[PDB]
């Protein structure tokens, strides 16, 4: 066994969420979507869409601001609002949280855990936010992926929608099974 | 206040550890060295050197193998040996552990915590392992660094020794204070 977790930050987006999900469903492959609360409450049917197709939803905060310096009650507001938006939309209560920019402190770990959330970063960054060549995304992913890789990618990127089927195809050929972040960590 | 943690994996190395430390001491700036146990036990005087100059030492495991699939007792061996090498060399007991490739599971969190260690990844990756242009390292670091950034870099790289003083200089100009990973997280 060799497992890899594909992850998508910053969604959901109209058009692109549905695109990303169709691709993953068509290739028998699941992923984790770390969703911004302001985006999620505008588009509750897109969260239903992510989850009915077997994907995991995580939190990416409500506002998508650096949380490093927030007071604790403001950490609670950002995380609890997003949990509530997600559970109202899907009936599934998320267990993971990726902080904006991956910026955290001990306090944000302690608050997250008290809300039943694990904080997760990533360990493969193909820098897909600053839109690169769809061949360049693929190479970084395929040269850096090992057993237990958590690949940071972004929703709403056409250069990411383009890279997905090559990435999936090569890593299936290299003997990787695709898992949610929760099933990777257990 | 805006704080940033510079980190160095895979050391210590003869020549380059001393180089990296002299630079940081000369510019009044501290960093965290995530040290491989096999390297550390060969070079105990280089760990003394990292710490006498105010830097933090973390664990990077004993063998530097993917730990995702180890039995728990083998996780204990890799982490406890490295803790012991470090405390025998420096008298300071490390509190942080970065897993090889950032690959982890719940079991490795639970074992780490029972040995008084926090697991830490990173959230800025200038891909300095696959030796790039010393101007290209700088740009990735400076375009991606925010408050609470943990910058993954590697010991024993001349293209990294070259980038250090520009990186430090620009981020001091942008108003960043340089902290150990422990003082960033508190
Ligand atoms: Ni984001
Ligand atoms: Ni390493």
Author numbering:
A (entry chain A), B (entry chain A): 136 to 321
The authors write:
Based on sequence and secondary structure analyses, NTR was confirmed to be an intrinsically disordered region. The crystal exhibited crystallographic properties comparable with those of the WT crystals suitable for structural determination. These results suggest that NTR plays a role in maintaining the solubility and inhibiting the crystallization of the catalytic domain.
Our previous study revealed the crystal structure of the wild‐type (WT) enzyme containing the NTR and the catalytic domain. Although the structure of the catalytic domain was successfully determined, that of the NTR was undetermined, as its electron density was unclear. In this study, we investigated the role of the NTR through functional and structural analyses of NTR truncation mutants. The truncation of NTR significantly decreased the solubility of the proteins at low salt concentrations compared with that of the WT.
